[PDB]
C-alpha cells in the first residue's frame, strides 16, 4: 500500500538507487523506523510494507536526495526530502509518493488510492 | 501589470539574462508579437507593458530557456517554455507569471494581485 | 514510443479524461496535427503514435488543462500547458511526459529512455 | 541572510499568515528552535536571523501547511512541509527558501545570492 517514485530533472531519467527511510510517529511522539528501501532502476520503491503493518499512523518518508547527488558526483543544497502525512485515518488507502529532484529544488506529490 | 520572474533549480538562482517574449492572440487565432525583454539579475523582467495596453485576452509568455542552458554549457530538453493564459479584468490586477528551470522540467505558476 | 502522464496536486490522483494534442512542426514551419487521445482512469495516455511515424522532428505536446478544469467546475489560469521538444534527433528513444496539475500551476518533467 | 516566501498554487496568490519555523540541528542531533513568524501579506517571511546569528550548519524549515489549508476549508495531504538543508559560507550570502503549495504536493526551491 505504499510506493515511492523519484525522478531525475537533470538527466531525464528514473532516480536509480535513492535510499528511502519511512519513519511512523510512536506514542511517545518519537520517529520510530518504519521500513526503508532503495529505488529500482525504474526510479520505484516497491514492497516497503503490508496491509497488515502499514496501520493508521503519521508517516514520515525520508527521500535521501544528498546521498544520491553526492554519489553522482554533485554538490546539492537539501539534506534529504521529507514528506509527512497522517494515512489510513478513514480506513485502508494506497499511496504513491513521488519526487521529482534538482540540485536545488524538489517537487513532490501524492497519488492516494482506495482499492 | 505583468512581470515574468525565471529561477534555475540546478544552480540554485535566478536566471539571468534570459529571453521572454509575450505574444496577444490576433483575432483570426495567430500571436501577434506584444512585449519582450531579458530577465535582469534578479532573474525577473520588468515594465514588459502598462496597464492602459495590457486589455483583457489570452496571451503567451514564450521564455527561451534552449538558449539559457546552452550558454551554461547544458544540453536541456525542451526547445522554449511556454506560458499561455487569459487576462481577466474580473480578477486581480497584478500578473507575476513564474517559472524554475530544470533541464528536463519546469514549472510555472500564477501569483495574481490586487 | 510517446507516452503522456497528468497528475492532479488538488485531488491527489490521477487526471483523468485529459486531452492531449499532439503537433509536429513541418517544412514550412507550421504546427502539423500529429496524434491526440484522452488520459485513462490512470492518467496515462498510451498509443498516440508508433515507432514507424514519429520520426524525428520538432514535437509540441498540447495538455488540455483549462478544458479539464473546467469539466471539474473550476475556473483555472492557463489555456493548457505544451510541452516543445526535439525528439529522436539522436536515433530513437521512448519518451514519457509528465505534468503535475493546479488551478493556478503546473510542472512538466520528460523521461528519455534508449530501448 | 534568510528569507522563506511561500505561495499558493490553488488560488494563485501568496500564502499569507502561514506559521513557520527554523531549527538548527544541535550537536547531539535534536532539532533546536531557531527563529519563527508568519508569512506576510506578500508570502514573505523576513527578518527571521542576522548574518551574526546564521552560522554554518543543518537547518530545517518548517511549514505549517496543514493550518493554512484548513483555514481556507480544503482537507491537505501533508501535516507540514519541510526543507532541511546546509548553510555554507563558501557559497553566496543570501539564501531564500520558496515553496509553492498544493493541497497534495508542494515544491520547493533554493535561491541563493550574493
Ligand atoms: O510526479 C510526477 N511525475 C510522475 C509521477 C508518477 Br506516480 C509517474 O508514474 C510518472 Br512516469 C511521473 C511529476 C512531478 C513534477 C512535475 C511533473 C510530474
Ligand atoms: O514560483 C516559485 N518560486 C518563486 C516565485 C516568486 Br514570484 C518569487 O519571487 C520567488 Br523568490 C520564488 C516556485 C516554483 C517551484 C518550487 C518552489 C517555488
Redesign the interface.
Known sequence: PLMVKV????????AINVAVHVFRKAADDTWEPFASGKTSESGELHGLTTEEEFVEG?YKVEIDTKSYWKALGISP????A?????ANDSGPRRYTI?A?L????????????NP
Do not use: N
Not at 102 to 113: G, Q, R
Open positions: 525522478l531525475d530533472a537533470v538527466r531525464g531519467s528514473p503519521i543544497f537539501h539534506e534529504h521529507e514528506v509527512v502525512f497522517t513521488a521529482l534538482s540540485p536545488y529544488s524538489y517537487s513532490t506529490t501524492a497519488v492516494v488510492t
